[PDB]
């Protein structure tokens, strides 16, 4: 009897989702390939920061994250929600989610005791002092905390460190959940995957003929397929028709649009071909966050006085998210039937959305162009 807090998180979630879609839009401008990031995880780090700021710095972050109506709720409501949404997920044995965060600040700056405890309590972020001026060393300790606290999963996250750096925030999300309905591994065979009209590769393609839930958006001419996980998490697979451009969809992704897809879902006996793959991708986010209006946090004008009262020197140097998605066969131990089933065959680039259903929180948003 503590599920009701996920259900109240639906507003934080919906605003964090919008932020996620605005960011994917921004990413979409800067580069051409695979994309994965966790709007949820990133907004833990950004909200933790937000509480450390004031003035325009804070205002920009509230507006950049769409959390203005929740920052007007009172000082401890946002942190109290994040504490609960994280802990509920975290303690869910049947959810295949691992999430965490790190902060690394230069020894020059003392952390105000209030913000230190607040950060560690609500957001589970410990601000660790580090001597960046010896980066050879600095990278060692940084990479050691991460690989240790993530029990081996995130080894050697930084290959290089700038000695000038003042403050680094690191978020990570790892997801590898079991399907409610498993793919039989013996149906997985190599299959063509079309990168474009000219290049195709081979991928290991999982297959199942069974009960599937999807819907078809007539405006965009794409299928939206639900692949349920254990632990009340679902992946929506968004596949367009060859004729159209999957990149165009990103201009139009909104919380409303996705809600409309969910409401028209129906369960059909269907043939599904879905490739098994793994995305492991680390993202430098600050320069994108700049693009979304969060500029003063990363400048010398930054107001971080609630984090450390001493210096106008201080600013956020880097914000990194490390994302890991792992998709394979592994699963858990009224239907429209045609005479012979239709098929959704995901053998060209597509978008995925992994969301937790009670919360409607967006665990991973991404674009898969060249599977790995």
Secondary structure in 3-state letters for the chain: CCCHHHHHCHHHHHHHHHHHHHHHHHHHHHCCCCEEECHHHHHHHHHHHHHHCCCHHHHHHHHHHCCHHHHCCCCCHHHHHHHHHHHHHHCCCCCCEEEEEEEEEECCCCCCHHHHHHHHHHCCCCEEEECCCCHHHHHHHHHHHHHHHCCCCCCCCCCCCCCCCCEEEEEEEEECCCECCCCCHHHCEEEEEECCCCCEEEEEEEEEEEEEEEEEECCCCEEEEEEEEHHHEEEEEEEECCCCCHHHHCCCCCHHHHHHHHHCCEEEEEEEEEECEEEEEEEECHHHHHHCCCCHHHCCCCCCCCCCCCCCCCCCCEEEEEEEEEECCCECCCCECCCCCCEEECCCCEEEEEEECCCCEEEEEEEECCCC
Q: What is the DSSP pairing of strand 189-194 with strand 266-275?
A: unpaired
125: tokens are 């972020």
What are the φ/ψ torsions at residue 7 (nearest 5 degrees)? -65, -25
**CA atoms of 304 and 217, how far apart (whole Å):** 45
Residues in the chain, how many? 372
Identify the sign of the CA torsion 111, 113, 115, 117: positive
Question: How far lies 185's CA from each of 164, 188, 189, 329, 366, in Å?
Answer: 50, 5, 9, 6, 25
Contact 119, 48 (CB under 8 A): yes
Q: Strands 318-327 and 343-345, how do they pair?
A: unpaired
Structure token pair of residue 112: 């105000």
Q: Which residues pair with 322 in a beta bridge?
A: 172, 282
The CA distance from 170 to 321, in Å, is: 6
Residue 91 CB contacts under 8 Å (≥ 6 apart), including other chains: none
Round to the nearest angstrom and report the end-to-end CA distance of the chain.
40
Given the DSSP bridges, would you call strands 200-217 and 189-194 parallel, antiparallel or unpaired?
antiparallel
The structural domains of the chain, ordered by start, are 1-178+277-329 (3.30.497.10), 179-276+330-372 (2.30.39.10)
Given the structure tokens 């162009």, which residue do they identify?
Answer: 369
| Contact status, residue 364 vs residue 36, Cβ threshold 8 Å | yes
Joined tokens for residue 15: 């605003």
Which residues on adjacent β-strands are paired with residue 201?
A: 193
Determine contact, residues 230/332, Cβ cutoff 8 Å. yes
Which are the contacts of 144, defined by CB distance < 8 A and separation ≥ 6?
Answer: none
Q: Give residue numbers after which the chain breaks (C–N above 2.5 Å).
A: 333
In angstroms, the CA 237 to CA 224 distance is 6
The resolution, in Å, is 2.5
Query: From its phi and psi, is residue 318 left (phi > 0), alpha (psi between -120 and 50) or beta?
Result: beta
In the block, tokens 């605003």 appear at 15
What are the two backbone dihedrals, phi and then psi, of residue 95, each rounded to the nearest 5 degrees? -95, 135
CB 101 within 8 A of CB 124: yes
In Å, how far from its chain's centre is CA 187? 30
The tokens 């003042």 sit on which residue?
Answer: 166
Here the tokens at position 260 are: 């409309």
Per-position b or e across 261-297, b if 16+ CB within 10 A of its CB: bbeeeeebebebbbbbbebebbbebbebbbbbebbbb
**CA-atom Rg of the chain in angstroms:** 21
Residue 168 · residue 160 · CB < 8 Å = no
DSSP bridge pairs for 227: 235
Sheet holding 277-284, edge to edge: 127-130, 97-106, 167-175, 318-327, 277-284
Beta-carbon contacts of residue 171 (< 8 Å; ≥ 6 apart): 38, 41, 42, 44, 45, 99, 100, 101, 319, 320, 321, 322
Q: Are 178 and 301 in contact (CB under 8 A)?
A: no
d(CA 279, CA 321) in angstroms, rounded, equals 13
Question: Using an 8 Å Cβ cutoff, are 277 and 252 in contact?
Answer: no
Q: Tell me how far apart the alpha carbons of residues 213 and 230 are, in angstroms, rounded to a whole number.
A: 16
Tokens of 45: 């780090």
């Amino acid at each position: 009897d503590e599920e009701y807090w996920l259900r109240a998180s639906q507003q934080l979630s919906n605003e964090t989702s919008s932020f996620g879609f605005n960011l994917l839009r921004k990413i979409s401008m800067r580069h051409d390939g695979n994309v994965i990031f966790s709007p949820f995880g990133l907004s833990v780090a950004m909200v933790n920061l937000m509480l450390g700021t004031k003035g325009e710095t804070k205002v920009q972050i509230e507006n950049g994250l769409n959390l203005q109506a929740l920052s007007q709720a009172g000082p401890l409501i946002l942190p109290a929600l994040f504490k609960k949404v994280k802990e509920t997920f975290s303690s869910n044995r049947d959810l295949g989610l691992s999430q965490g965060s790190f902060a690394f600040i230069h020894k020059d700056f003392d952390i105000k005791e209030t913000y230190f405890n607040l950060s560690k309590k609500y957001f589970d972020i410990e601000y660790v002092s580090i001597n960046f001026q010896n980066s050879s060393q600095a990278r060692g300790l940084i990479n050691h905390c991460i690989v240790k606290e993530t029990e081996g999963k995130i080894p050697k996250l930084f290959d290089e460190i700038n000695p000038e750096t003042k403050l680094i925030l690191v978020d990570y999300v790892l997801f590898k959940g079991k399907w409610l309905t498993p793919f039989d591994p013996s149906f997985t065979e190599a299959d063509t995957f079309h990168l474009d009209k000219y290049r195709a590769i081979k991928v290991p393609m999982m297959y199942r003929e069974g009960n599937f839930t999807s819907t078809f958006d007539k405006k965009f001419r794409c299928h939206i397929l639900k692949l349920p996980y254990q632990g009340n998490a679902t992946m929506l697979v968004v596949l367009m028709e060859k004729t159209g451009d999957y990149l165009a969809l990103e201009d139009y992704l909104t919380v409303d649009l996705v809600e409309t897809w969910l409401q028209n879902m129906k369960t059909r006996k269907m043939e599904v071909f879905f490739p098994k793959f793994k995305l492991n991708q680390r993202y430098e986010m600050h320069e994108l966050l700049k693009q979304m209006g969060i500029r003063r946090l990363f400048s010398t004008s930054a107001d971080l006085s609630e984090l450390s009262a001493m210096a106008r020197n201080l600013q956020v140097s880097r914000v990194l998210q490390q994302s890991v998605l792992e998709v394979d066969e592994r699963g858990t131990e009224e239907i429209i039937a045609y005479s012979m089933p239709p098929a959704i065959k995901v053998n060209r680039p597509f978008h995925f959305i992994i969301y937790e259903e009670m919360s409607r929180m967006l665990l991973f948003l991404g674009r898969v162009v060249n599977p790995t």
